[PDB]
């Protein structure tokens, strides 16, 4: 990324296959790069314990006149992440349809073995996969762009907590400040 | 307003903001079965939640000269999930269904589609006399093609878009539960099937419930634009569904 | 009755939830208007009956900045030639330690008591020769609020505090400690100050315009050992009793000025292969 | 002046403390670090007409 | 008479007719998960008599050298019906066990056996430092011989028996719950092993619940007779089962 | 009322017992049901009338694991030219000293407050020149929970703890004492843990899997001798509020590593001359 | 705040201590080692049926 507003875009053509991916990360709030600088992170990242669920907004900046559904699915820790959309819709997933209302909400549901997860997530404490894929695919009308771009916000609900404060890592010195 | 529609299975759920109302079988929802109509003896087992959701089928493309496609149940669904597992290890199986069926395209766009449920579609071979075996009709979640001439080729059913395979005017259809997908004011068709059958329960490898079909009756057309298809996509969910007589696997 | 017995909030439960089919539809929102959806699990799949004990008692204010923590070292000798290295002199701010600093710097305004501990230890400088016998030493920490007199050397008359408040302090004995009330002329500490000192738009500029805290002297009372002797002073602030206002967001660069906002361009965050990449 | 409250303990699993003060200025009192309330809407619900989450956002 | 006893467990019983009493675990009778003490959100499946019913293990065959087996749970049953099934699709597990062992001999034949579950049953290996894969303790149904003499080979674990590959005393082991077979007045043992865990649920493919072990504490020992061995059957059936976190299968 | 009156049990008594000749049987059992004889000695002799005051109030899980015992220690010099040897990093656990150890491994679980104690000596070590004067000394000992930032050298800016709790103590006082609450993820601590990391049965395999508890770092504040000096801290847990769960057979084998089972075979007890031999 | 209650001495052969707590964190507290309940049952007898010891174990 030579230009850096670009790493909050994620890209969308017209004519792409029939199933494809669109994007996939790690749910690891405090410790992936994606979620790690994010207001959410930042806070996680001064405690060692996290519970509860997530919430994954999504928005379609596209024109007015395009149209198409994507499919959202949570994939619950496994020995392996899905490589398909037809492994992907097996776990929780949410079919997104692009309208008037420019937002839709995935929800994660927090399905642990523990009531507590650590910030330094590992093996033991794996959290799962996120990914998404073209449900039906992005038609436009004659005269319009032919890409488009959507953003993800990330948020705590209400049933969100922390513990064990600690020292951040992301901030350090090496000599007096003057 | 009543253009949107939520839709919420065990771990799934379907939202669309352009649509229709849902169609409601022969006006049966569908439900558990009764003490007073069972005739089978052990205890069901009642995989709720498990079972109990949306399964994406494989997408297919409509193009300009697409005749239609139909989908056989419940063997579509007999390799998915824990469904097919429970099919698979079991002697009867019950349950109703939830046809969801997208197709978005701009407002540019024209065409129209007929999304309707056969039960009991009885289909006849291309040659009369002949006989085929159970690949020509279902071979899983595969989309199998109309075709706008008379089949020629005796290992195949008689794909005649006019007659639709049983021997009655595609027109007609209309009597049986559907929904039309038109692009002017629509983008998904939604159907609940209750368990329509002669007998309380039934095996489901042996016996198709019934039939999707999905036929233009208004061809594509476009000008100009980049968009050269218009993908379409099925999801099904099982409602209710139970199951009885446990056996060794492999059906 | 002697005795008044002043004498609790846990997250919100879970409900149970069953299938829906509706015209409502919670999932989809517009956050065009601003506003956070405060949709919960329940609204998009199944879920059973929870209740939650959980409580986030340890996220509030007060205990996120309710711990001690280190904000200035200097070391000063016992005797020297050079007159200003026998004793310390500290402009009071919170702006030279980057972790208490980043902490502060999450909200726009403060309000708060204050309670300071003092650290202080002493070594032996090296030399040839090292044999010599020193009864234990003393030292006294001198506050001088803005405007007073500050003392030019180790044996000045300031030393004499009549007004000035003024600590004592026994090596072996427990750290010294003291607590100080809210000293603002504000109604409220300011972390940030976007502005100028004079009307016309010049002079100083930022946070450093408001910093009138005053001054703090270190020196020994009246040891003076044959050999040098190195003493090192670690000061510790503690809030109490606090109040924030304006959220902002955590700082992302690193700091380089004790008393300005200046920084080098970062990048967002880390990058990996492509965007479907997913394993270690 | 003695002042008799609950400390802090586990869920469904004597729990008092006694606490008195020395000092004639309040500032010398200990953190009271006892205070959980909270209200989030400041910050998630800024908007001026309220919305209600089942119904669409806008129209 | 109480030496008789009968169990039901779905569509499968066991009978028998010479029998001691059933030991239950530590007092505790297996129970489904209560609403205050679950963490996870969404909604389990029980699947109840499809899962909740008899399994026979493969059988072993005592002889006069023999000096015992063990057995771990739940991937011994892993690969057995629709409860590997689930153990595969779902996240998180959780069910107690019944287990029913046997052994049957003529009133001239003497011997006696330990049967004993043994939860959270850690082992060392034969080599102090080096490490196994998880191929020496565990690779399905089959059961896994202890050996008289000291462990050599470093890519398994130390069998010697005296120890129980456990650092112990083998004759401590009376205190986990257990009984024992004696040839004499005895053919069968059973035992009810309730849900022990840290935790309210976890996985069943990453962490062994408890170890069965069975342990010959008198040989084996006959005349003249036809009869070379005498066959050793052990039957499992989970109780209250009930998963959750449905992803992809493939564990 | 300003005072709450709070405010035990001996063994069972013996009973008389006369003749007896009947058909009931209480000597002969079956221990193939698993089940414990409850028989007592009135029930097979003739007996007197004894009442017991005898009680087992020292034998509650509470008092036995209620004594504080050694688990770790360690040597640090003041000054030296390696760096990593002016301090030291300790992962927290109960698995270094043997008879804890052995202790804590007769439960499977164990839910408890802890309560930490540190004991700190020094002394100079040996060489030519040992004349000199140095002040009291001070330490300082850090708890890192998972996760935070590390120092890797006596001066690094790691040591300025703004969130991380510390304590500071100086020689000559009494010892350090603190307590800590029960701080397990899960819903109890777990001695041993029979599994794997991954989930496809490969990794780690036991209870290093579960330990997560952090780190503990320890420093001279800012002592720096001419001549070196050596100290030693000793930790010390004491369990309290305890609770425990499936007892197990204690161990009979020798420890040999710190993160395993490993051991080797052992005989079961020793020998004597013949099964009739009952002298010397 | 005060607490009273007994403390441990002999058998037919005041004993009374007070207490209070001074910190707001139940981990704090002393030891509670005054408890002295148990019940074997769980181990010795683990049985489904109630046995007799008078009555014979088997028939
Ligand atoms: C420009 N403001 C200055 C105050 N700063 C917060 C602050 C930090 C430390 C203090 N210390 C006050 C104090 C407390 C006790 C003794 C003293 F000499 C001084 C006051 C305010 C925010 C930025
Ligand atoms: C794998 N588990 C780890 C915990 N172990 C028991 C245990 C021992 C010591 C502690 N100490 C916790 C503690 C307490 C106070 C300060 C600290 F830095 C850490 C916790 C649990 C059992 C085996
Ligand atoms: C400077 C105050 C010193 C207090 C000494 C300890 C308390 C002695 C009195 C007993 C407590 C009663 C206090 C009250 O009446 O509120
Ligand atoms: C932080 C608590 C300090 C307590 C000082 C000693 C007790 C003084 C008050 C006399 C005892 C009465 C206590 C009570 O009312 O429960």
Same mark, same amino acid.
């Given at each position: &990324?030579?230009?850096?507003?670009?790493?909050?875009?994620?890209?969308? &053509?017209?004519?792409?296959?029939?199933?494809?991916?669109?994007?996939?990360?790690?749910?690891?709030?405090?410790?992936?790069?994606?979620?790690?600088?994010?207001?959410?992170?930042?806070?996680?990242?001064?405690?060692?314990?996290?519970?509860?669920?997530?919430?994954?907004?999504?928005?379609?900046?596209?024109?007015?006149?395009?149209?198409?559904?994507?499919?959202?699915?949570?994939?619950?820790?496994?020995?392996?992440?899905?490589?398909?959309?037809?492994?992907?819709?097996?776990?929780?997933?949410?079919?997104?349809?692009?309208?008037?209302?420019?937002?839709?909400?995935?929800?994660?549901?927090?399905?642990?073995? &523990?009531?507590?997860?650590?910030?330094?997530?590992?093996?033991?404490?794996?959290?799962?996969?996120?990914?998404?894929?073209?449900? &039906?695919?992005?038609?436009?009308?004659?005269?319009?762009?032919?890409?488009?771009?959507?953003?993800?916000?990330?948020?705590?609900?209400?049933?969100?907590?922390?513990?064990?404060?600690?020292?951040?890592?992301?901030?350090?010195?090496?000599?007096?400040?003057? | 307003?009543?253009?949107?529609?939520?839709?919420?299975?065990?771990?799934?759920?379907?939202?669309?903001?352009?649509?229709?109302?849902?169609?409601?079988?022969?006006?049966?929802?569908?439900?558990?079965?009764?003490?007073?109509?069972?005739?089978?003896?052990?205890?069901?087992?009642?995989?709720?939640?498990?079972?109990?959701?949306?399964?994406?089928?494989?997408?297919?493309?409509?193009?300009?000269?697409?005749?239609?496609?139909?989908?056989?149940?419940?063997?579509?669904?007999?390799?998915?999930?824990?469904?097919?597992?429970?099919?698979?290890?079991?002697?009867?199986?019950?349950?109703?269904?939830?046809?969801?069926?997208?197709?978005?395209?701009?407002?540019?766009?024209?065409?129209?589609?007929?999304?309707?449920?056969?039960?009991?579609?009885?289909?006849?071979?291309?040659?009369?006399?002949?006989?085929?075996?159970?690949?020509?009709?279902?071979?899983?979640?595969?989309?199998?093609?109309?075709?706008?001439?008379?089949?020629?080729?005796?290992?195949?059913?008689?794909?005649?878009?006019?007659?639709?395979?049983?021997?009655?005017?595609?027109?007609?259809?209309?009597?049986?539960?559907?929904?039309?997908?038109?692009?002017?004011?629509?983008?998904?068709?939604?159907?609940?099937?209750?368990?329509?059958?002669?007998?309380?329960?039934?095996?489901?490898?042996?016996?198709?419930?019934?039939?999707?079909?999905?036929?233009?009756?208004?061809?594509?057309?476009?000008?100009?634009?980049?968009?050269?298809?218009?993908?379409?996509?099925?999801?099904?969910?099982?409602?209710?569904?139970?199951?009885?007589?446990?056996?060794?696997?492999?059906? | 009755?002697?005795?008044?017995?002043?004498?609790?909030?846990?997250?919100?439960?879970?409900?149970?939830?069953?299938?829906?089919?509706?015209?409502?539809?919670?999932?989809?929102?517009?956050?065009?208007?601003?506003?956070?959806?405060?949709?919960?699990?329940?609204?998009?799949?199944?879920?059973?009956?929870?209740?939650?004990?959980?409580?986030?008692?340890?996220?509030?204010?007060?205990?996120?900045?309710?711990?001690?923590?280190?904000?200035?070292?200097?070391?000063?000798?016992?005797?020297?030639?050079?007159?200003?290295?026998?004793?310390?002199?500290? +402009?009071?701010?919170?702006?030279?330690?980057?972790?208490?600093?980043?902490?502060?710097?999450?909200?726009?305004?403060?309000?708060?008591?204050?309670?300071?501990?003092?650290?202080?230890?002493?070594?032996?400088?090296?030399?040839?020769?090292?044999?010599?016998?020193?009864?234990?030493?003393?030292?006294?920490?001198?506050?001088?609020? +803005?405007?007073?007199?500050?003392?030019?050397?180790?044996?000045?008359?300031?030393?004499?505090?009549?007004?000035? +408040?003024?600590?004592?302090?026994?090596?072996?004995?427990? +750290?010294?400690?003291?607590?100080?009330?809210?000293?603002?002329?504000?109604?409220?500490?300011?972390?940030?100050?976007?502005?100028?000192?004079?009307?016309?738009?010049?002079?100083?500029?930022?946070?450093?315009?408001?910093?009138?805290?005053?001054?703090?002297?270190?020196?020994?009372?009246?040891?003076?050992?044959?050999?040098?002797?190195?003493?090192?002073?670690?000061?510790?602030?503690?809030?109490?009793?606090?109040?924030?206002?304006?959220?902002?967001?955590?700082?992302?660069?690193?700091?380089?000025?004790?008393?300005?906002?200046?920084?080098?361009?970062?990048?967002?965050?880390?990058?990996?292969?492509?965007?479907?990449?997913?394993?270690? | 002046? =003695?002042?008799?409250?609950?400390?802090?303990?586990? =869920?469904?699993?004597?729990?008092?403390?006694?606490?008195?003060?020395?000092?004639?200025? =309040?500032?010398?009192?200990? =953190?009271?670090?006892?205070?959980?309330?909270?209200?989030?809407?400041?910050?998630?619900?800024?908007?001026?007409?309220?919305?209600?989450?089942?119904?669409?956002?806008?129209?």
């Amino acid at each position: &990324t030579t230009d850096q507003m670009e790493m909050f875009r994620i890209p969308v &053509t017209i004519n792409a296959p029939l199933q494809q991916q669109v994007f996939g990360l790690r749910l690891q709030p405090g410790l992936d790069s994606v979620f790690k600088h994010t207001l959410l992170g930042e806070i996680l990242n001064y405690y060692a314990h996290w519970s509860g669920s997530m919430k994954l907004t999504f928005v379609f900046c596209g024109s007015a006149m395009a149209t198409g559904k994507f499919l959202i699915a949570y994939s619950p820790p496994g020995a392996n992440p899905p490589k398909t959309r037809k492994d992907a819709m097996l776990g929780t997933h949410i079919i997104w349809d692009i309208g008037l209302q420019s937002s839709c909400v995935l929800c994660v549901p927090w399905i642990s073995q &523990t009531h507590y997860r650590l910030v330094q997530q590992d093996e033991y404490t794996s959290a799962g996969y996120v990914t998404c894929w073209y449900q &039906t695919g992005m038609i436009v009308p004659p005269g319009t762009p032919n890409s488009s771009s959507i953003m993800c916000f990330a948020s705590a609900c209400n049933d969100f907590s922390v513990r064990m404060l600690r020292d951040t890592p992301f901030i350090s010195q090496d000599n007096k400040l003057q | 307003s009543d253009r949107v529609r939520s839709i919420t299975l065990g771990n799934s759920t379907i939202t669309t903001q352009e649509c229709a109302n849902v169609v409601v079988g022969y006006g049966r929802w569908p439900t558990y079965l009764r003490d007073d109509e069972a005739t089978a003896e052990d205890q069901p087992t009642q995989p709720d939640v498990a079972t109990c959701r949306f399964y994406t089928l494989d997408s297919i493309k409509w193009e300009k000269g697409s005749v239609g496609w139909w989908w056989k149940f419940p063997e579509a669904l007999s390799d998915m999930g824990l469904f097919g597992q429970n099919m698979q290890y079991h002697y009867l199986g019950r349950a109703g269904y939830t046809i969801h069926v997208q197709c978005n395209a701009s407002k540019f766009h024209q065409g129209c589609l007929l999304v309707v449920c056969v039960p009991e579609a009885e289909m006849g071979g291309a040659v009369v006399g002949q006989a085929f075996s159970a690949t020509a009709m279902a071979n899983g979640d595969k989309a199998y093609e109309f075709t706008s001439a008379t089949q020629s080729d005796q290992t195949k059913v008689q794909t005649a878009i006019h007659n639709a395979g049983m021997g009655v005017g595609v027109g007609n259809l209309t009597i049986y539960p559907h929904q039309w997908i038109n692009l002017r004011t629509n983008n998904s068709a939604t159907i609940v099937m209750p368990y329509i059958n002669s007998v309380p329960m039934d095996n489901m490898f042996r016996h198709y419930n019934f039939t999707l079909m999905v036929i233009p009756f208004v061809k594509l057309d476009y000008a100009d634009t980049a968009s050269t298809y218009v993908p379409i996509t099925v999801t099904v969910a099982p409602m209710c569904a139970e199951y009885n007589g446990l056996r060794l696997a492999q059906a | 009755g002697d005795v008044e017995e002043a004498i609790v909030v846990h997250v919100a439960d879970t409900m149970r939830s069953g299938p829906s089919n509706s015209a409502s539809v919670p999932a989809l929102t517009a956050v065009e208007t601003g506003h956070t959806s405060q949709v919960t699990p329940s609204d998009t799949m199944q879920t059973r009956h929870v209740k939650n004990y959980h409580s986030r008692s340890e996220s509030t204010v007060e205990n996120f900045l309710g711990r001690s923590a280190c904000v200035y070292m200097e070391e000063y000798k016992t005797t020297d030639n050079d007159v200003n290295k026998k004793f310390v002199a500290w +402009p009071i701010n919170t702006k030279q330690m980057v972790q208490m600093r980043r902490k502060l710097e999450m909200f726009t305004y403060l309000r708060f008591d204050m309670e300071v501990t003092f650290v202080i230890t002493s070594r032996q400088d090296p030399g040839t020769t090292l044999a010599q016998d020193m009864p234990v030493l003393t030292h006294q920490i001198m506050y001088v609020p +803005p405007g007073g007199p500050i003392p030019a050397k180790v044996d000045d008359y300031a030393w004499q505090t009549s007004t000035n +408040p003024s600590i004592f302090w026994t090596e072996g004995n427990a +750290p010294a400690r003291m607590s100080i009330p809210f000293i603002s002329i504000g109604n409220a500490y300011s972390n940030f100050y976007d502005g100028w000192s004079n009307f016309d738009q010049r002079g100083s500029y930022g946070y450093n315009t408001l910093n009138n805290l005053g001054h703090i002297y270190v020196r020994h009372v009246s040891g003076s050992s044959p050999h040098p002797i190195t003493s090192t002073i670690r000061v510790y602030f503690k809030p109490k009793h606090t109040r924030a206002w304006v959220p902002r967001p955590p700082r992302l660069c690193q700091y380089k000025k004790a008393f300005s906002v200046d920084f080098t361009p970062t990048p967002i965050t880390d990058t990996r292969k492509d965007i479907n990449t997913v394993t270690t | 002046g =003695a002042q008799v409250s609950t400390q802090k303990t586990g =869920a469904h699993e004597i729990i008092h403390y006694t606490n008195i003060n020395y000092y004639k200025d =309040a500032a010398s009192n200990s =953190a009271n670090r006892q205070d959980f309330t909270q209200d989030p809407s400041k910050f998630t619900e800024p908007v001026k007409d309220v919305m209600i989450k089942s119904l669409p956002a806008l129209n």
